[PDB]
Amino acid sequence: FHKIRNEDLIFNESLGQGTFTKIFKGVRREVGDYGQLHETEVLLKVLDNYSESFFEAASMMSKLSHKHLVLNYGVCVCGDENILVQEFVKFGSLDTYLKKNKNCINILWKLEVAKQLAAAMHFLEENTLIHGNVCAKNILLIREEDRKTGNPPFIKLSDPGISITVLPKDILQERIPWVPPECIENPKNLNLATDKWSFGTTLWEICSGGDKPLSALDSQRKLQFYEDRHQLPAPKAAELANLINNCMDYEPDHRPSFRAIIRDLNSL
Ligand SMILES: Nc1nc(Nc2ccc(S(N)(=O)=O)cc2)nn1C(=O)Nc1ccc(-c2nc(C(=O)O)co2)cc1
């Protein structure tokens, strides 16, 4: 990663937290193209020991440029804290957007977002790179739909974060049902098939107005939910329900490739 100086970063408002990270909007002073000076909005992700895992994952994905993958500017390793400096996306995380706009999101919008997300996962699948934390909070909305201009919404997938292969078991349990059954029994089972399961969970989120599946269940009950091989309920808008269940297959080898997923998406 390109190294950025603490002196060139200004921290502004907190935008929340993630798994062992705090999120801030900020401004980076930089020399850009043609030597012009810029003050650029940036997203700063701050590691509050786990630093190696967070930066390795973001790094390996930033080796692959793609229109549906988030852009990382570099890191700030100055001082005491370790900071990832990332493009600032105008409309934030999808999960809060879905909740703040539930009454105005229709199947055409959902299918366009599902197709884009699958296009990103297909690209990762072809490059044999595992994301490991596909969820609606990690979908960034770049631009909203404009039914005037007929322009569709546009999303990007955010960086993987700390790998489930190093997170404490009780955080992994709280991430059920995004983390697949085989990773709960062993996080070292992390595989390309892992992302197919979480992709199904994310389609469920996309269809449920920002509800978190199984949120009423405490950690012990989430474990028992996998133990009994339950599936998620079909959302009220059930147009994607079959795809969701096809993706959340308890047999990882039976989960369909993202090519087949895309073909299935196109058939609607
Ligand atoms: N690049 C970027 N740009 C913006 N912009 C923005 C715009 C508006 C708003 S607001 N307040 O008006 O709604 C908020 C933000 N946000 N952003 C981003 O990466 N956010 C983000 C942070 C953390 C996570 C995440 N961490 C985990 C984990 O578990 O570790 C799981 O997900 C996911 C996404």
DSSP the chain: --B--GGGEEEEEEEEEETTEEEEEEEEEEE-GGG-EEEEEEEEEEE--THHHHHHHHHHHHTS--TTBPPEEEEE--SS-EEEEEEPPTT-BHHHHHHHTGGG--HHHHHHHHHHHHHHHHHHHHTT------SGGGEEEEE--BTTTTBPPEEEE----S-TTTS-HHHHHHTTTTS-HHHHH-GGG--HHHHHHHHHHHHHHHHTTTPPTTTTS-HHHHHHHHHTT--PPPPSS-TTHHHHHHHS-SSGGGSPPHHHHHHHHHT-
Q: How crowded is residue 77: how many other Cβ atoms within 10 Å of its Cβ? A: 15
Given resolution (angstroms): 2.0
Print the domain residue range for 114.
Answer: 89-268
Residues 213 and 145 in one domain: yes
Please state at what angle helix 192-207 crosses helix 107-126, rounded to 10 degrees: 170
Residues 217 and 126 in one domain: yes
For ligand 1, atom 34, the nearest C-alpha belongs to 138
Residues 171 and 255 in one domain: yes
Residues 22 and 125 in one domain: no
Residues 80 and 45 in one domain: yes
Residues 55 and 106 in one domain: no
Please report where in the chains the tokens 């798994």 appear, as a residue: 19
C-alpha 82/C-alpha 75 separation (Å) is 8
Vertex 163, ends 196 and 198: CA angle to 5°?
Answer: 20
How many Cα atoms are found within 13 Å in the side-chain-facing hemisphere of 268? Answer: 18
Residues 117 and 50 in one domain: no
Domain count, the chain: 2
User: Which of 64, 88, 112 delimits the end of a domain?
Assistant: 88
Residue type, 128: T
User: Closest ligand 1 atom to the C-alpha of 15?
Assistant: 11
How many Cα atoms are found within 13 Å in the side-chain-facing hemisphere of 18? Answer: 20
Residues 141 and 32 in one domain: no
CATH number of residue 4's parent domain: 3.30.200.20
Beta bridge partners of 38: 30
Residues 33 and 95 in one domain: no
C-alpha 184/C-alpha 81 separation (Å) is 31
User: Which of 45, 65, 88 delimits the end of a domain?
Assistant: 88
CATH number of residue 201's parent domain: 1.10.510.10
Q: How was this structure determined?
A: X-ray
For ligand 1, atom 22, the nearest C-alpha belongs to 23
Q: How far is the CA of 171 from the centre of ligand 1 (A)?
A: 19
User: Closest ligand 1 atom to the C-alpha of 93?
Assistant: 34
Residues 12 and 56 in one domain: yes
User: Closest ligand 1 atom to the C-alpha of 23?
Assistant: 22
Residues touching ligand 1 (Cβ under 6 Å) are 15, 18-19, 21, 23, 43, 70, 86-89, 92-93, 96, 137-138, 140, 158, 161
User: Which of 88, 113, 128 delimits the end of a domain?
Assistant: 88
